[PDB]
Amino acid sequence: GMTMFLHVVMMEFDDGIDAGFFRTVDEYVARMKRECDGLLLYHFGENVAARSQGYTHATSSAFVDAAAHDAYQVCPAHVAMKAFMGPRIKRVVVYDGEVPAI
């Protein structure tokens, strides 16, 4: 298709998180492309920008379209990840939008 839907979730976590937290997140990340439809990209990692503003990590994702991102809401890997990460997240900021493919 000529476009895709980008969804980027920037996050600042509690200071208590450990390597274990990230190990479990990565396990949810792994389930995601297996389990959700229309997912082109799905990654969780460290923010290396200078002007990160305290947001140290992000989930970055691209879907074939906004409807695939809508369905991702009940993707069980995602419902589960959200429930897992939620209590440890201090702040988030999100960018969603349609962008050219590639």
- The mark string for 10-49 relative to Cl ion (x by CB under 5 A, - otherwise) is -------xx--x----------------------------
What does 71 bind: a copy of itself, Cl ion, none (CB cut-off 5 to 8 Å by kind)?
none
Question: What part of residues 54-73 is at the interface with a copy of itself (CB under 8 A)?
Answer: 55, 58, 60, 62
Which is it for the CA torsion 91, 86, 29, 16, positive or negative?
positive
Q: Which is nearer to a copy of itself, 24 or 47 (CB)?
A: 47
For residues 70 and 18, what is the distance between their CA atoms, to the nearest angstrom? 31
What does 17 bind: Cl ion, a copy of itself, none (CB cut-off 5 to 8 Å by kind)?
Cl ion
Please answer whether residues 49 and 69 qualify as being in contact, where contact means their C-beta atoms are separated by less than 8 angstroms: no
DSSP H/E element including 70: helix 66-72
- Decide if residue 78 touches a copy of itself (CB under 8 A): no
- Decide if residue 6 touches Cl ion (CB under 5 A): no
Residue 88 DSSP one-character state: G
